[PDB]
Amino acid sequence: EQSWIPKIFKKKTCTTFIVTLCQCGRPRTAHPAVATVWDSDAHTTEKPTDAYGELDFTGAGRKHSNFLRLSDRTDPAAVYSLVTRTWGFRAPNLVVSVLGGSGGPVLQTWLQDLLRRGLVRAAQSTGAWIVTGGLHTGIGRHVGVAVRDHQMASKVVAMGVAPWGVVRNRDTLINPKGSFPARYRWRGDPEDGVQFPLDYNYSAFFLVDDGTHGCLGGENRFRLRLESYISQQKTGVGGTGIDIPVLLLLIDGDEKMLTRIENATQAQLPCLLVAGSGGAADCLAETLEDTLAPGSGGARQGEARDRIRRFFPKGDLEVLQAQVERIMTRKELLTVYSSEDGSEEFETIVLKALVKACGSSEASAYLDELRLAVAWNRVDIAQSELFRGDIQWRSFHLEASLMDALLNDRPEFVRLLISHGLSLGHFLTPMRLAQLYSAAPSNSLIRNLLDQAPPDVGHVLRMLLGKMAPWSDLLLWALLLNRAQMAMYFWEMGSNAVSSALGACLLLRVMARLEPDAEEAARRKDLAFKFEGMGVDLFGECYRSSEVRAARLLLRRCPLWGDATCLQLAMQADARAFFAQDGVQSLLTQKWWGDMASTTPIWALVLAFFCPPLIYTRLITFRRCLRRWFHFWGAPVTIFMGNVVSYLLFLLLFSRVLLVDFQPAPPGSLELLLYFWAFTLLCEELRQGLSGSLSQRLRLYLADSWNQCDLVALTCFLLGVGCRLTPGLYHLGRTVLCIDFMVFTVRLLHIFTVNKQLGPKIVIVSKMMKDVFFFLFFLGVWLVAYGVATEGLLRPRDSDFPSILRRVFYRPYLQIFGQIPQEDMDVALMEHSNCSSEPGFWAHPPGAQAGTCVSQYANWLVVLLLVIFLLVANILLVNLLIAMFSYTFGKVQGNSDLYWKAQRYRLIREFHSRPALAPPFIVISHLRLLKEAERKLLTWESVHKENFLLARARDKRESDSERLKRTSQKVDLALKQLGHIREYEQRLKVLER
Ligand SMILES: [Ca+2]
Ligand SMILES: [Ca+2]
């Protein structure tokens, strides 16, 4: 699989001998028989490489480390092609060449923290490369341990170049046919100062061969050539890609490092220097700090720095000064990274260095910098540098960046790119949308839905909602992928803003209910709440602007979201806060009163209902006569009042029949009328269920508690009729009909839900069930204990299971409500008599169900138990229940009010489609049963949304915190200008004298 590797690469040997010890490092005794000044290329022999393979470090590791030995005189193009194609390494978006000596086995804690936190994280984020020394020493060791720490805390392709000869255990790497299995003794016990082990954190190794036993600086030429070639290469895909930025990071160093950085600046490579690193690196930082310092008093400052910031050797020599001057001749390329007391953030510094290194008006040269800015989450640097207006951009130049920002969840970046005159409509294509949807994160819920379902999002939406403009598509994609800021921005640019917000809330809630992550669902619910709040604010502003237009058209309309009104969307989403606002409540009241004025008094309505001619007077404010009659009798409130009156009459008839007319004889006229009335009620309930996708509407109808109560009442009535008509089940029928009448009477509580001050009371009463159950359980346990103890102590002689159960449960239960049979428990209140032959003394209670006679061995204990039971039950439990009720009532007032306001719409919709006749007469009604304006309204809504967003932005900018930020920036700019003025004044004073 590596046949061409020995052919396209070469290895260098010592060949000639140039002295007992050569400059080549190989002794004359072990020297080729072919044996002034040694020459790297003239005194060497080229041979095929015999050290390539994949290293597998013993112990922990990835079992994959491509190692290659190549001669110094090799074109970097072949090496780069080998890495990109044969080894499968992806084209890097960035190459960072960390350089320096870093004398000392350990480095500063702040420096190591900066390395690990900035460089490795940035490389992981952008998929960069880190090219360092391929040895376990100094900066190579530091970057290796930083990469290891980052890896174990989560990959990063951190390569390494090392000279051939300074590598320990080079004997095990030789296999001409391939070293794919390779064991390396990196943990070797012997230690030496000339050969170093290879780090186990590097993905690849390039062993530069120069025909020496091992030295330093022999890989510098190949390193620089590789960096320069990579700097002039595209990110794969041939010429369709963009250039690969290359940056050099220098930490400490020596004269060799100074020559390296000078050559790199000559080769037009951006460089980055860290302040505080040490010698040979802080010298450049101090020189940049001086900047255009005057020669007078600064000419000797160079020698001063060379003597204080560098070692005494070569400090007096001016060759170092010449190198410094050559470096400063091209100071534009390189920059200095201020420590800033451990900033641990240098992505902005890298972006600034890269943007200042190019210096070209063409936008093609800044594509790599824009991609790096998009990969990171900093937008101020990109806007200030790339989008300063000097660079002329284009839609096709920004399309790839927009795609990358969308895929990588960069909301500020997509906002900025769209803001810069980008045609979104022409940008979006079906293939791009398919890519966006395929960019789902791993095995997410949306990914599962896509797999179950060419995006084919219509099927997913139909299966989620029920199935009963690029901005909309982008909003749907963001909601499906759960991107909060993306969804917010897309909604801000939408057309049907209120409907979009309500549908977004519905979709987020229904997907959170379906999401098994148990943590992403919380974020979905939070985003749904945010969208609901935005919709509430927007609709409130629209209603305050024009009540009629908003209330009429904006809600009662069918958009393209689901072909359902906004009220229906809110009801499905259970957006209680949407119904809580005053505009929605006013619209609901207007619909509830129909064609009648919402200010019509209740007594006037009752008088009109009981006096039909009264509707043709000034009492009620709204052919003409028939129209008025149908308007009055079709209003939902009148339907509700008629239904209430009919239900009261039905209950009265039921009570009359059950109490008087219910006889074992065949049913009379009134009983038949009651049967017909119940049949009509059943027909009405069936109509409600069937017309409330048969299964979906049926289960929606069954979801209401009142509908369940009606169904169970009708079932009980049917069972009662069946038992009554049975020849031998009259009593059972009567009993079950009594229970059914109780259920029908309990059904009457639905009336109070209409009243504004009573519905929340009903909701709170419904919520009191937890406290009720707790009290019931505690009371049941205490009753069981006390009853069993008292029954055991008394020892009544009845000993009958029904009587035992009575004396254990029923009597102590009645003792709670003041029914205390003292004469049945206290022996002192009952006469003594002989009843049983059992030993002891017995007394005869006067009660009928208290037993024939009870024991009187320890009756003071019975009295004490009675006292304790009375205390506990009648005081402690009752007061605890009262306290719990008070606490619950105080706690859930607002939630109950919101729930009532939400269900008010459901009630109004239920009574909007009910037949206009009463249930007794509903049989005949059942038998009879069986553009420019839209665009103007949307423009008005969009204008109001824009005004709301502008007002919110103005409020945010006018806040105290933002004002403090702005004044701090102003003070900083003033200080900078004052420093410039001080320098100018000093220069002018120097020149004048
Ligand atoms: Ca560039
Ligand atoms: Ca019903």
Side-chain angles (χ1 to χ4, degrees), residues 619-623 626 628-631:
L619 184 63
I620 303 297
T621 56
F622 296 88
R623 202 171 52 86
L626 293 181
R628 195 184 191 96
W629 178 273
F630 279 101
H631 288 357

Side-chain angles (χ1 to χ4, degrees), residues 589-617 619-623 626 628-661:
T589 300
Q590 292 185 8
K591 302 301 294 182
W592 168 261
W593 282 94
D595 298 328
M596 298 168 56
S598 306
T599 61
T600 299
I602 302 300
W603 59 266
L605 173 65
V606 176
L607 263 58
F609 184 84
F610 288 151
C611 299
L614 257 55
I615 74 181
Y616 287 92
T617 60
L619 184 63
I620 303 297
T621 56
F622 296 88
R623 202 171 52 86
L626 293 181
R628 195 184 191 96
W629 178 273
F630 279 101
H631 288 357
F632 177 76
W633 290 106
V637 58
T638 58
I639 303 309
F640 173 80
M641 210 63 182
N643 178 268
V644 163
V645 171
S646 178
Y647 196 81
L648 292 181
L649 293 183
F650 167 78
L651 288 186
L652 178 61
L653 176 60
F654 201 176
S655 65
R656 149 75 182 184
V657 169
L658 185 61
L659 292 184
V660 179
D661 299 318

Side-chain angles (χ1 to χ4, degrees), residues 2 5-7 9-10 12 48-56 65-66 68-71 82 87 162-165 167-170 172-176 178-184 198 204-209:
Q2 312 297 145
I5 304 304
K7 310 303 296 179
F9 295 109
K10 300 297 297 180
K12 284 189 173 62
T49 175
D50 49 74
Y52 63 99
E54 303 187 357
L55 300 186
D56 305 328
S65 299
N66 308 337
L68 171 63
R69 164 187 171 184
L70 45 87
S71 58
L82 155 73
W87 292 356
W164 175 266
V167 175
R168 301 171 56 182
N169 299 268
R170 280 177 287 101
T172 179
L173 315 178
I174 299 178
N175 197 336
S179 307
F180 322 129
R183 316 305 298 183
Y184 192 76
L198 307 185
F205 285 87
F206 307 99
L207 302 180
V208 179
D209 188 6

Side-chain angles (χ1 to χ4, degrees), residues 313 315 318-324:
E318 302 303 325
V319 288
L320 201 156
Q321 182 65 25
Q323 296 183 12
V324 170

Side-chain angles (χ1 to χ4, degrees), residues 684-685 688 701 704 706-707 710 747 750 910 914:
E684 168 60 23
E685 211 66 26
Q688 291 180 17
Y701 151 80
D704 193 5
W706 302 111
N707 292 335
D710 291 324
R747 157 76 188 192
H750 188 211
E910 172 186 358
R914 180 180 295 266

Side-chain angles (χ1 to χ4, degrees), residues 243 245 354 358 365-369:
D243 52 328
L354 291 181
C358 295
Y366 287 113
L367 296 181
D368 42 321
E369 287 75 17

